[PDB]
Amino acid sequence: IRNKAFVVRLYPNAAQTELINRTLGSARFVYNHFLARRIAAYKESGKGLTYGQTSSELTLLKQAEETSWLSEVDKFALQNSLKNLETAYKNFFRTVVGFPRFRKKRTGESYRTQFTNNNIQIGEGRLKLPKLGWVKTKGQQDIQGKILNVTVRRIHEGHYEASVLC
């Protein structure tokens, strides 16, 4: 009936921590890369890129050779980074808010993955995340809605979370 978030605290292992860090880095990388490619499009021609064109170019990047490591990262993370860039532009175009800006390596950075075809399963003391598998979570609230996305977030050097949506 409505979207509400069940913020649990992920306790990822070594592999899961490495994968979450890599995924956040790759989401930031595609955000920066396509911000550059979307500003450069306006300089070259009057019309800039849309989300479809940036998504196709992201597919090419994941199929590239120098940036092949984007394929190991969860696909939803990169596509939601591109959708975040699209929202950054849409807010700017709604008024004439500030223009989108590049992204330096932050702390409170989160990547979002979507539920499809039994992708996200909430357990007793575990969570079924797509590229991670089962993550040990504490404070897992009782399921109440239909899963849509899980925004794997980093708060501190070792304090991850997950804003599981319903």
Next chain:
RNA sequence: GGUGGCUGCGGGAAUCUCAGACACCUUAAACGCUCAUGGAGGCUAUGGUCUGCGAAGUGAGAAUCACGCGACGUCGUGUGAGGUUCAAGAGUCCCUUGGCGC
């Protein structure tokens, strides 16, 4: 012998158990600790307190219990568990709000 909180986990908060230190001692304030480096300033009301007998700043490590495994009773790793009471909607973007340093 009693008392209080600082730091770590116990999802959060407060208690509370344990742990890393303490400190006061009939009163509830204050403070993390260890190590290496750093080698002379941080912190309060023009002036006082800790500190040249180790300041500010770098970072790191340790900081709950049970079991399994490995290495030399000690270290690492893996899994599991962590009470009570309350509560829990988050994500994205941009901006400005405070603190600090210069």
Next chain:
DNA sequence: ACGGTTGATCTCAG
């Protein structure tokens, strides 16, 4: 087949 994963889908705009 089972389980999970990916690319396409959405038009603009400074």
Next chain:
DNA sequence: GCGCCAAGGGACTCATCAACCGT
């Protein structure tokens, strides 16, 4: 005043499916 660290504020939105890849 201008860098960093963090937070706070306001507006807006919060995926789905056919196809594919290794077991």
